[PDB]
């Protein structure tokens, strides 16, 4: 585990992370996809061998010795707010299980269901709070990756508010 487990936020491409493993914001079919998923496909294409997994689950595939945790959040275009919220919570609980199983001291993680799976809503707070519910009992250093300058400020403020 980390000596003093922390949360941090960085505004940059998660394919350039400095952590011991990465969480892909995957689609259920293990396809290259777009956004974070396409960046992850270009950087770790070997990790997409048999990476298909259902909504609300995470499936780890090794690229060399580097673990890629494919986490499948719900597309809020298709799910009801209620069922989508349950699947989004579940995906992050499965990430925490994988991070623990792998024995890593650090993980790079995007905000699941905040981009093309957001159904056109701002889900920063919803997605981040489910990330914290899952990851608070883990001892890995967590580094959250985002692309927007206003999102960076809001995530940083949310981390600092817990102290
Ligand atoms: Cl970048
Ligand atoms: Cl998304
Ligand atoms: Cl963002």
């Amino acid at each position: 585990g980390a000596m003093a487990p922390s949360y941090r936020v960085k505004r940059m491409d998660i394919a350039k992370n400095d952590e011991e493993c990465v969480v892909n914001a995957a689609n259920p079919r293990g396809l290259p996809g777009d956004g974070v998923c396409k960046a992850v496909y270009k950087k770790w294409p070997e990790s997409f061998k048999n990476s298909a997994t259902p909504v609300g689950t995470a499936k780890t595939v090794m690229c060399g010795t580097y673990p890629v945790i494919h986490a499948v959040g719900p597309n809020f275009s298709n799910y009801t707010e209620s069922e989508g919220d349950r699947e989004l919570a579940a995906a992050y609980r499965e990430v925490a299980k994988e991070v623990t199983r792998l024995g890593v001291n650090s993980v790079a993680i995007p905000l699941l269901s905040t981009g093309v799976y957001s159904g056109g809503k701002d889900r920063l707070t919803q997605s981040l709070n489910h990330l914290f519910t899952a990851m608070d009992s883990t001892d890995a250093d967590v580094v959250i990756y985002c692309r927007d300058k206003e999102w960076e400020k809001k995530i940083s403020e949310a981390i600092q508010m817990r102290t």
Side-chain angles (χ1 to χ4, degrees):
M3 278 313 103
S6 64
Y7 290 107
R8 301 167 53 232
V9 60
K10 295 202 300 185
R11 182 180 83 97
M12 54 181 285
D13 182 359
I14 199 173
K16 305 172 171 187
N17 77 78
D18 194 27
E19 290 66 63
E20 293 186 356
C21 72
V22 69
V23 174
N24 183 28
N27 55 71
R29 301 188 182 268
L31 296 160
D34 305 295
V36 161
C37 191
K38 168 51 48 138
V40 167
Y41 182 72
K42 286 184 184 146
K43 184 58 68 176
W44 302 288
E46 301 89 341
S47 73
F48 287 68
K49 197 151 173 278
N50 293 309
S51 64
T53 197
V55 173
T57 77
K59 184 166 199 191
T60 302
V61 186
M62 309 299 303
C63 175
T65 72
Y66 187 80
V68 176
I69 304 169
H70 299 273
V72 182
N75 180 0
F76 279 98
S77 290
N78 293 334
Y79 285 89
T80 63
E81 289 290 345
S82 175
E83 188 68 7
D85 182 73
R86 190 196 71 68
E87 288 295 12
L88 177 57
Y92 280 113
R93 289 187 301 275
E94 296 302 304
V95 167
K97 298 182 189 174
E98 284 301 277
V99 168
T100 297
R101 182 185 63 78
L102 288 165
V104 293
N105 291 343
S106 64
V107 54
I109 193 161
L111 291 187
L112 302 176
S113 299
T114 64
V116 298
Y117 282 9
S118 72
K121 289 202 184 181
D122 173 347
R123 298 186 186 272
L124 188 168
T125 297
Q126 173 182 26
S127 192
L128 183 61
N129 281 341
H130 284 324
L131 187 162
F132 287 153
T133 297
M135 304 303 293
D136 277 354
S137 62
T138 74
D139 61 4
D141 285 336
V142 171
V143 184
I144 299 164
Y145 286 77
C146 67
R147 296 304 292 272
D148 187 69
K149 314 194 132 173
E150 292 319 302
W151 281 44
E152 182 190 10
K153 290 182 195 152
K154 285 182 275 192
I155 298 167
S156 182
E157 285 164 348
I159 295 162
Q160 295 325 125
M161 286 283 273
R162 335 175 80 201
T163 291

